[PDB]
Each structure stands twice: as structure tokens, then as C-alpha cells.
């Protein structure tokens, strides 16, 4: 019945106004896979930050995924070098203490010529640190605010003629060049241009930077190999089956668990005070602080909870038809958010922390904002209710999975669905999109993960190692593609995303004994057992506690979390 669907598609295009060549080319564009973007997480050499321009996102001014290929102000470009030399009381400290002054002076003198108010920010931001080292010269540089003010100060006008000399060693010059080459587009190239055009280094410089870039290009890692992560498991003990899904913050200092009796429980994962004294020390050591704070603002059971990337606010979604906001440094409620008439099941912040999306029983997802009490977009189009919600890592699309065996990608501005992904056989329960952004992964309640690509919309492959049960959470490797799935069968499994695709991801050159005999025992029967894909590599069981949360930290250490069940 798929050839008849192809004929219905062709007649739909013919009646909806696509030329025969145009429909053939749109079919050929729909069939081929999304190619590889080499700047996939935007590596810090050729990648830029997002603009902070106070406008909402817009997925327009944008070409297709099928086609092949793919200002930066002075204060942050100096603060990068400032913090990099400030993080070191090493053997190379006072040479950076020497060379930190004329780069600041030349950046200030090159920034007064373009933007005066940014220059007034930049001067007084980094003023009082070397005043005792460089005398009243910075007091002489108070009266420079324009191009004609530079002609008043004779040393500032001489700084264009007198190139500032500095005698630098070879190891310090190579350290500075290999630091300012490893991140160009933050401002390293802007520092390098000032160093090349205004400084006098004692030991041509363009050939030196060419040799730096060529020797840095001569040794890289082209195709990455897999790595098995270390999992730290947080097991919660005295929860009599009344602890819903939990979450960890970033820096992993706070854990938030939503209870069935309308509390949010807040744990300091370091054993810290979690009282935020802030030197006031007024009174009340008479209370009992077990390094754990409770939050009582809900009247229903808390079904989801999400932490801001700022990590100072908590967002709790309940079955009373509100989502509440909590301050993590005074432990009270701030804002109630009322836009649903059914229970709330999955709240999730943006990547940049701008605005949060919500899932509920009313078959619609809702886009919000943390400063608006009522919603901003309604995501309608599912047949059953929405279970999970997640953004694209740029904060520009929304992904919602629902209990009618499908998930959708929504435009965040126009509201209408852009992708519909079909192929599952159970309620989609957890969804996650890779830091590359070209591949979407989700897990159902059938114990089957699968990955599609967002350009073609069809299935690359699936993952068949979990038990016929729920896949509660999902997490991604920070750099590259290794999927960590914490489900309901008490295991945390590890998945290679790049086995059966056109990207093989650098297999080893040269055997085992345990491989292909563990599921060749099959004592329970062939039809009554699971057979794993070739993508599953490892599986860590937890001994009778289930894993509600997997959270892959920055440094190849994942954290799992759950409650000790009996």
C-alpha cells in the first residue's frame, strides 16, 4: 500500500502546483541524507556565539539541509586573555603580568576610534588592577574619549608612532600564539591583529603564525573512536514509591526530586550547608537542617522538574494545573504559570534559558516565557497527549513526543509542525537531539530507541537492547555521538550511533569470547528473549533500583539517578 501512497503523493503535488521537474527534484532532495557539517558543535576556532540582540528566534533566512556545505567586541576578547593569564600562579605568571598592559592600552586606543561608550566600559572595567604598577598614566588617560582627544594626549598620539617594544622568550611567545590560535573567533584573531600591527616583539611574524597554524594542523584527531563512560549513580533510599522523576543541576551540586505528596525535595549533592547565609548570620540554628530543603507550593503531584542553565532557578510542573518557579538561593516560590487545564508532565527550559516548553495531557504542547504568566505558542496536532518535550540545541525548534507512537518538530515562531516522525510502536517517553543537530533520537515504552535524521525525516536505524519496558531518560556525549540510555529495566546502556550509517566512526583494526554467546544461551526461548543490535556495547545494571535520570557531564562522566525501590 506504499506504491498507492506514492501515487497519492504525486497527484497531490500535481494538483497543489509543483512542476514535473520541480516535483522530481523535490523527491530527489527528500531522499538523500543530511550531509556532514564539519563545524557540528561549532568548534571554537570557526564557531561564533549567538547574538544577544533582544529579538525572538526565527528559522527563516535559511537554505535546505540537503545542499552540501555550511562585531565581536573588545571587552570579551580581552577578558578571555585576562582570565587565561589570571588562572595561573605558575612559573609563567609574571611574564603575563608584564605583557598584559600594552595589549589593554592598544585595545583601548583602537576602540576609542570606533565606539566611545564601549571604550568607557572597557577602560573602567580593567582600571584599578595595575594603577600602582603603571603610575599616573591611566589618570592621564582619563581625558581621552574621542578621536580628537587622542591628539591632546601626547603619549597616546605617540603610541601610533612608537611601537611598544617587549622582549619575550620563545616559550612564552609560542604559548601565546598557540593559545590565540586554538580559539580565533572568540577574539583570538582580534588580539593577534593588534599584536601583529602595533607591538614590537623581541626574540617577520606572519610566517610565524603560518608555521603555528601548519604545525597545529599537522596533528589532530580526524575520525574519533568510542569511549566508555564512567557512571556515578545516586540512589535515594527512603522513598516509599512516592518519588517521581528527578533532575541534577549543572556543576551537579543540587538535586531536585518531585514527590507524590506535593513537595520538591532539594539535596546538596556535596553535603554542603544549602542555607545561603551570605554572612548575615542572624539567628535560627534551632531548626534542623539535614542539608536538604523542602519546597511546598504545589497542590498536586509533581510529575516533572527542570533546572535552568543559569542553575539559580527551578521549574516544577505538577498535576495541579500550574508550573511554578523557585529561587534556588532563598528557597521560596516566585511565579505561578497557569495555561493548562490538564496535568503537566514535562517542563524543559531553553538552551539559552530564554523560554520554556511544556507537555500536558490536553494533547498540546505550550511555549512560554519566564516573564509572561500565560503562554506564547500552542503546539497542537498530536492525536494523543504529549509525554516528552525538548528543544533543538539552538533554541529554535521544539521536539514533542506523544502517546500515539509518533513525535513532531515544531517551528517556534509560526507554531506549525515542520516534521512528523513515524515508525514507533509504543508511547514515545524520552526524546533527545544530538549536539550536531542533524540526528534525532528517542525511546519508547517498547524498549526500542531509534534515530532519524531531520532532513530526510526517515529512519537511519534503531536500537534493540533494552527490555520490553520503558526508557525513562536519555543523554548524549558532549563531543561526538555516544548515547546513554537509563531505563526501567534497572540498566544504563551505552550505544554507538555511527555503526550502520555512512559514518563508521573509526572501528578498531583487529575478537572476544563473551561476544555473541551471551544472547546465544537463550535458555528462556528464542521468541521470549531480546536480541541486541550491533550498536549496543555495554550495559551497567543497578541491582533492583531503577534509573530515572541520566545526565552526561562535560568530562566523560555521566551521572545516573534513581530511587531504591523496595
Amino acid at each position: 500500500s506504499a506504491s498507492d501512497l506514492n501515487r497519492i503523493v504525486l497527484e497531490y503535488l500535481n494538483k497543489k502546483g509543483y512542476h514535473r521537474t520541480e516535483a522530481m527534484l523535490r523527491a530527489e532532495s527528500g531522499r538523500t541524507l543530511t550531509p556532514q557539517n564539519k563545524q557540528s558543535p561549532a568548534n571554537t576556532k570557526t564557531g561564533k556565539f549567538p547574538e544577544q540582540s533582544s529579538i525572538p528566534p526565527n528559522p527563516g533566512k535559511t537554505a535546505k539541509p540537503i545542499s552540501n556545505p555550511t562585531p565581536e567586541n573588545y571587552i570579551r576578547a580581552y577578558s578571555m586573555l585576562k582570565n587565561w593569564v589570571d588562572s595561573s600562579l605558575e612559573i609563567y605568571k609574571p611574564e603575563l603580568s608584564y605583557i598584559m598592559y600594552p595589549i589593554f592600552i592598544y585595545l583601548f586606543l583602537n576602540l576609542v576610534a570606533k565606539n566611545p561608550v564601549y571604550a568607557r566600559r572597557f577602560f573602567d572595567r580593567f582600571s584599578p588592577d595595575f594603577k600602582d604598577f603603571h603610575g599616573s598614566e591611566i589618570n592621564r588617560l582619563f581625558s581621552v574619549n574621542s578621536i580628537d582627544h587622542i591628539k591632546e594626549n601626547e603619549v597616546a598620539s605617540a603610541f601610533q608612532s612608537h611601537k611598544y617594544r617587549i622582549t619575550m622568550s620563545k616559550t612564552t611567545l609560542n604559548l601565546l600564539l598557540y593559545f590565540l590560535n586554538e580559539n580565533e573567533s572568540i577574539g583570538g584573531s582580534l588580539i593577534i591583529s593588534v599584536i601583529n600591527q602595533h607591538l614590537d616583539p623581541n626574540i617577520d611574524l606572519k610566517l610565524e603564525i603560518q608555521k603555528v597554524k601548519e604545525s597545529r594542523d599537522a596533528i589532530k584527531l580526524d575520525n574519533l573512536q568510542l569511549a566508555l563512560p564512567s557512571v556515578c549513580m545516586y540512589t535515594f533510599q527512603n522513598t516509599n514509591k512516592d518519588m517521581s522523576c528527578l533532575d541534577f543541576s549543572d556543576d551537579c551540586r543540587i538535586a531536585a526530586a518531585g514527590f507524590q505528596d506535593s513537595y520538591i525535595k532539594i539535596w546538596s549533592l556535596d553535603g554542603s550547608s544549602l542555607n545561603n547565609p551570605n554572612i548575615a548570620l542572624n539567628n535560627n540554628d534551632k531548626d534542623e537542617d539535614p542539608t536538604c530543603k523542602t519546597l511546598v507550593g504545589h497542590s498536586g503531584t509533581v510529575y516533572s522538574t527542570s533546572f535552568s542553565p543559569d542553575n539559580k532557578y527551578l521549574l516544577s510542573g505538577s498535576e495541579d494545573k500550574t508550573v511554578r518557579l523557585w529561587s534556588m538561593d532563598t528557597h521560596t516560590a516566585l511565579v505561578s504559570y497557569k495555561g493548562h487545564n490538564h496535568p503537566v508532565w514535562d517542563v524543559s527550559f531553553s538552551p539559552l534559558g530564554h523560554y520554556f516548553a511544556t507537555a500536558s495531557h490536553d494533547q498540546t504542547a505550550r511555549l512560554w516565557s519566564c516573564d509572561h504568566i500565560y503562554p506564547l505558542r500552542i503546539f497542537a496536532g498530536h492525536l494523543n497527549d504529549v509525554d516528552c518535550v525538548s528543544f533543538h540545541p539552538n533554541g529554535c525548534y521544539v521536539f514533542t513526543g506523544s502517546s500515539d507512537k509518533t513525535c513532531r518538530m515544531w517551528d517556534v515562531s509560526t507554531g506549525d509542525s515542520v516534521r512528523l516522525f513515524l515508525g514507533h510502536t509504543a508511547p514515545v517517553i524520552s526524546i533527545a537531539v544530538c549536539p550536531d543537530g542533524r540526528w534525532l533520537s528517542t525511546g519508547s515504552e517498547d524498549g526500542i530507541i531509534n534515530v532519524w535524521d531531520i532532513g530526510t525525516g526517515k529512519r537511519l536505524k534503531q536500537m534493540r537492547g533494552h527490555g520490553k519496558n520503558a526508557i525513562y531518560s536519555l543523554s548524549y556525549s558532549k563531543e561526538g555521538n555516544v548515547l546513554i540510555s537509563g531505563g526501567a529495566d534497572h540498566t544504563v546502556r551505552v550505544w554507538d550511533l555511527k555503526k550502520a550509517t555512512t559514518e563508521p566512526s573509526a572501528e578498531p583494526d583487529e575478537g572476544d569470547v563473551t561476544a555473541s554467546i551471551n544472547q546465544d544461551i537463550k535458555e528462556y526461548g528464542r521468541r521470549r528473549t531480546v536480541i541486541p543490535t550491533s550498536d549496543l556495547v555495554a550495559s551497567f545494571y543497578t541491582k533492583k533500583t531503577p534509573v530515572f535520570k541520566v545526565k552526561f557531564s562535560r568530562s566523560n562522566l555521566a551521572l545516573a539517578g534513581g530511587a531504591f525501590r523496595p
Binding site: L228, V231, Y303, G465, K468, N518, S539
Partner: protein, 165 residues
């Protein structure tokens, strides 16, 4: 038909009203719609069960599929010492041409309900952390499983495929 009742359950409510004789087409269509409504309760119940992070279908998982589906609440299915499956299906047969089960219950005094001591309360929740894996293998502390008794405990549809690095 469908699997709820031809007449053997719906008709004994039809007689509870007073309605003597009605056709079997009425009872067929009526019982089909009644167990469709039962499945409509059951599906929201398994949705609340899944989002409450559990595996059993407790009585508060169907009692929250009632408030969602606006059904008037079924009071009296939660008592003291709320344990998992507090066994109370002691329904007593009564004979005849067919079967009748009437759910016997023992009466009790009030002064043995006010002069009855209070149960045990557990500790407030805490956590405890360890290493599930250090490089992709499991370090076999007391907190780790044994990976060979995982065979003799759970079938491979509730424990999944065992593979190791």
C-alpha cells in the same frame, strides 16, 4: 459480543433498577460501550502509572484517571497501612443456578478504633552514591550486581540483553 458480559453482569444491574425483560441487542451494545469506557479509564490509568515512575497499576492510578475523565469519585479504596497490594479480594460465593459473590465485611466497634495504636513511620529520605562504572566495566563493590544472578532473577523481557565491555 465482547468480553465484558453477554447478560451475566449488565442484566443484574438492569434488574436492580426494576427493568424485567429487555432484548439481547440492547445488552450487547450496552456492554460493548461499558467496557469501552473501562478501557478508556485503563488507558489514562497507564498514562498516570508511566508518568508516576512505577510498574504496578495502583488504586491511585485509576483514581486519577477519574478526575481527568470527569467521573464521579469511587471513594473507599484506600485504608490504613497503605502497602503495595493490601490484599482485600475476599469475595464469598453464594449458590443458585448461577454464581453470586457479595464481598463479606466484618463490623467493628468504635472503641477499638479509637483505642488502637499508631503504626510505624519510616525515616525521611536520604541518598547514597557509588560508582556504577569507572571505565565501562563494573567494579563489583557490594552496591553492584553480580551479572550471573540477573539470569535467575528476571526474564529477558524485563531485564534486557546482557552484554559487557
Amino acid at each position: 459480543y465482547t468480553i465484558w458480559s453477554p447478560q451475566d453482569t449488565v442484566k443484574d444491574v438492569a434488574e436492580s433498577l426494576g427493568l424485567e425483560n429487555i432484548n439481547d441487542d440492547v445488552l450487547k451494545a450496552l456492554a460493548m460501550d461499558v467496557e469501552y469506557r473501562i478501557l478508556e479509564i485503563i488507558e489514562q490509568a497507564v498514562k498516570f502509572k508511566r508518568h508516576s515512575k512505577r510498574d504496578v497499576l495502583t488504586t491511585d492510578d485509576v483514581s486519577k484517571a477519574l478526575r481527568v475523565l470527569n467521573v464521579e469519585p469511587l471513594y473507599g479504596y484506600y485504608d490504613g497501612s497503605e502497602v503495595n497490594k493490601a490484599v482485600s479480594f475476599s469475595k464469598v460465593n453464594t449458590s443458585g443456578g448461577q454464581s453470586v459473590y457479595y464481598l463479606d465485611e466484618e463490623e467493628v466497634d468504635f472503641d477499638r478504633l479509637i483505642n488502637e495504636p499508631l503504626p510505624q513511620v519510616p525515616r525521611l529520605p536520604t541518598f547514597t552514591t557509588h560508582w556504577l562504572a569507572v571505565e565501562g566495566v563494573q567494579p563489583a563493590i557490594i552496591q553492584n550486581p553480580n551479572l550471573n544472578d540477573i539470569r535467575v532473577s528476571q526474564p529477558p523481557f524485563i531485564r534486557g540483553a546482557i552484554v559487557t565491555a
